[PDB]
């Protein structure tokens, strides 16, 4: 249903971002990075919950000294989060880091940003351009007066086309608007002018329930419009909750999922079976399937197949039988023992 | 920034829905209707949490005789949910109920529906047209094959224009989709083809956090596209939480709120003051303001005022002073005792 934004594909370690690739779920470590064992324990929990790339803060000397061990033992690509010293970007990259994220706007002189980018090109490390009100250049503040959506977007564009000029192509940008509406607009202006992958999220979303709502609204809207190649929910909470939240939002729009998802039809006046009965049977035999598949349990046979185009696999149920279908095309007719064969086909998938 | 859909105004009791009106927060009661004490106690709790219209389910005969007492002392306009028997619709309207909701596609034959509608015009009671896959007619089901977004939308349009034919205007519609994406598309198709008020919400959102997330996505999208004149969040949780969720969704897009909202600037390289300090001062002095205003505490002076156009009121702070502003216009320069004058203006905003 969503018309995805065309985007060039990039790479952070083993993970594809943009274009053809699924939208990636990201998170940030909340532990002190210099504490190797605590951070790796949190990364492992993040991996367990489906976090695909992890961002690691590196504010001090001791965090740089921890980075090598973290990358070697991380089941995930690691992004080094840099803020003030261009040298930390260089030192982080030498430590084996798969990605750096910088605010090119205040990291230093433009010519130093070029060197960071040229070093990243030599080591095959991805870059994230972060742009926000605090990184907005003096020249654009004068043009717009204040950090407007357009001011933030033009900044992102400006840097993006500098990266292209410098011959560097392996980057994604991130635009943090002050609220949901400014965040949407700022990214929307950028999205429509370029094919550069986008990191999306709401920075200071809030606490617990309220933060979760604001995140769902913000990320959901962008996602709806086919915008976002990577996602992070930013909650002042356990980073696993942040990962779980991101997956629920994506699941809402049928873009990603964790484990098996069993969906029943609406239903309608075409219904041919007792759907609640077969659904219950499906839930029981498919309990303990750890494969990100949308499974469709449909009330009729013929029209159900068209209806469940986007489902990976499902059963189009008739009075004494069902049709097993796969990616919108029917495979075979099976008796009221269609479920074991549906399970059999998923183990084969 | 929000492109609000042009809608005609309707009335449910004394509450205005659509057109010029703010988006109405609605909720359904969870207790049995025939229990009169439990329902009115929950209604009071919902009103205190900001709920503007209450929906009351009526599946049996005892629940109908309960309605009379409920509508007399309820602070909210009450709406009866007519499910199985269309007989309940006539009986509910005689009880003095402000609104009804029916699924006319399966509530019976068209003749009876027409009489339900004509009785609603004489009493002055609003009708909500409920359309979902289950209420879809054999006619359209054969046109589209299955209950697609455009199948759902056409049914809503068809019933809408049948109400027009009967000379009835005081109605709104809701369209339930299979998932968020279908719900959005079906409501979008309807929204562009008519000026009829829409009730929006996700019916089977889920339990707890999962339900909250799914609702926020579904409602957030439609709200962003300027669609929805009344909202209900549907959770298996407490109805009060639904109201709390609805207000937070609307708050994130700056459409509705409960109580004061104090917002600081981003900030940026123009910053003229220690903002966290002045923000904490505002939080302290403004604690005790119940009016749903948006108060902006900005880091600089000149360019801050334009930045905070949409805010009801705020301070644009400099070294030893600040500009007090409302809706993007400067009003008076105040010394670093800029705060007592800000509250003094908000007190005066209320009178
Ligand atoms: S699968 Fe068949 S019975 Fe179920 S909603 Fe679709 S058309 Fe109706
Ligand atoms: S109010 Fe001033 S300091 Fe604050 S974000 Fe706007 S321009 Fe920057």
Swiss-Prot record, chain B:
Cofactor-binding details, from the entry: Binds 1 [4Fe-4S] cluster per subunit.
A single MF term (Gene Ontology): iron ion binding
Subunit structure: Homodimer.
Known cofactor(s): [4Fe-4S] cluster
GO biological process, one term: isopentenyl diphosphate biosynthetic process, methylerythritol 4-phosphate pathway
Xref: Pfam families: GcpE
UniProt catalytic activity: (2E)-4-hydroxy-3-methylbut-2-enyl diphosphate + oxidized [flavodoxin] + H2O + 2 H(+) = 2-C-methyl-D-erythritol 2,4-cyclic diphosphate + reduced [flavodoxin]
Consequence of substituting residue 26 to E: Reduces activity 100-fold
Result of altering residue 128 to K: Loss of activity
Protein family (similarity comment): Belongs to the IspG family.
Key words of the record: 4Fe-4S, Iron, Iron-sulfur, Isoprene biosynthesis, Metal-binding, Oxidoreductase
Pathway it works in: Isoprenoid biosynthesis; isopentenyl diphosphate biosynthesis via DXP pathway; isopentenyl diphosphate from 1-deoxy-D-xylulose 5-phosphate: step 5/6
EC identifiers of the protein: 1.17.7.3
Binding site for [4Fe-4S] cluster: 265, 268, 300, 307
Alphabetical list of NCBIfam families matching this protein: ispG_gcpE, PRK00366.1
Gene3D superfamilies: Dihydropteroate synthase-like, Sulfite Reductase Hemoprotein, domain 1
Keyword Iron set for record: yes
Identification of the protein by name: 4-hydroxy-3-methylbut-2-en-1-yl diphosphate synthase (flavodoxin)
Function: Converts 2C-methyl-D-erythritol 2,4-cyclodiphosphate (ME-2,4cPP) into 1-hydroxy-2-methyl-2-(E)-butenyl 4-diphosphate.
